[PDB]
């Protein structure tokens, strides 16, 4: 199965760590927890942001242009990214916006962190049709000494 994982501010605004005004180590922990030992597919901007492979996961970069780092696997299409994951129970698509958009039609599961922040930005998580998705897990957390904003972990499965 194919899953998308993402952190969303109000109105589905998303973006690179450098652009977003939150700092949520608990959410990054949740990201790691749910992606570890699974292949991750990302776009080139996301790859440029992290600066090095996410450890303990197969790192696949989707880009129409040739690769510029042999530490990871580079692919040129959606079909090609999926083949590069091989026979695994779950492929994790980790963004950003355009990549989420490209994989959503193939996905059956969404891991969304709803962050209580109003953010000015032009990138959004794709406009999934909520009624077509069933919420199977929800978990709310207050901001604290470590986490700048309140946030809610959600898992949805396609109906």
């Amino acid at each position, epitope marked *: 199965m194919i899953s998308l994982i993402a952190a969303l501010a109000v109105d589905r605004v998303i973006g690179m760590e*450098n652009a*977003m*005004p939150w700092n949520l180590p608990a959410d990054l922990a949740w990201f790691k927890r749910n992606t570890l030992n699974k292949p991750v597919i990302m776009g080139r901007h996301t790859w440029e942001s992290i600066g090095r492979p996410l450890p303990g996961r197969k790192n696949i970069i989707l880009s129409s242009q040739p690769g510029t780092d042999d530490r990871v696997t580079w692919v040129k299409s959606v079909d090609e990214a999926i083949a590069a994951c091989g026979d695994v129970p779950e492929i994790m698509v980790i963004g950003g916006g355009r990549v989420y958009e490209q994989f959503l039609p193939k996905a059956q599961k969404l891991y969304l962190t709803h962050i209580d922040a109003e953010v000015e930005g032009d990138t959004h998580f794709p406009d999934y049709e909520p009624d077509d998705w069933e919420s199977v897990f929800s978990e709310f957390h207050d901001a604290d000494a470590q986490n700048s904003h309140s946030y809610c972990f959600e898992i949805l499965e396609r109906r």
Partner: nanobody, 127 residues
Framework: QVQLQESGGGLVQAGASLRLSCAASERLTVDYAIGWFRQAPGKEREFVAAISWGGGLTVYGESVEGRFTISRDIAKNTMNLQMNVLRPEDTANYYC????????????????????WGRGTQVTVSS
């Protein structure tokens, strides 16, 4: 393409403060981070401070926590490092850098993975 230009280096006594500035020749986008590394004679370059351009979030090298403050102004397209309670071991050439690498990773990223670099400004702290 983007050029970084440092300023504000000089010689001060131990205990004094000094403010460094870095100007970018073109406007940075929200996806950038900008920051300082320093390098003393005979030593490896080390991370000092970084700030995310969009978020304005910051991270500091362990030897300067509490003493240095990094800030940036989006309109002026400039970043500043206010350095306080300077110690002799703070002596180094200070280099401004910018990159799309997440600000939070700058304290461990090999520095040559950041590709926009200024030419450095010398800071000397005497006893």
């Amino acid at each position: 393409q983007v050029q970084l230009q440092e300023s504000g280096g000089g010689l001060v006594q131990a205990g004094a403060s000094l403010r460094l500035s870095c100007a970018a020749s073109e406007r940075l986008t929200v996806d950038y981070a900008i920051g300082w590394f320093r390098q003393a004679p005979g030593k490896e370059r080390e991370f000092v401070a970084a700030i995310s351009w969009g978020g304005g979030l910051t991270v500091y090298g362990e030897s300067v926590e509490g003493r240095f403050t990094i800030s940036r102004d989006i309109a002026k397209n400039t970043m500043n490092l206010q350095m306080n309670v300077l110690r002799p071991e703070d002596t180094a050439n200070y280099y401004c850098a910018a990159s799309r690498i997440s600000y939070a990773v700058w304290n461990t990223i090999p520095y040559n993975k950041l590709t926009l670099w200024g030419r450095g400004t010398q800071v000397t702290v005497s006893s």
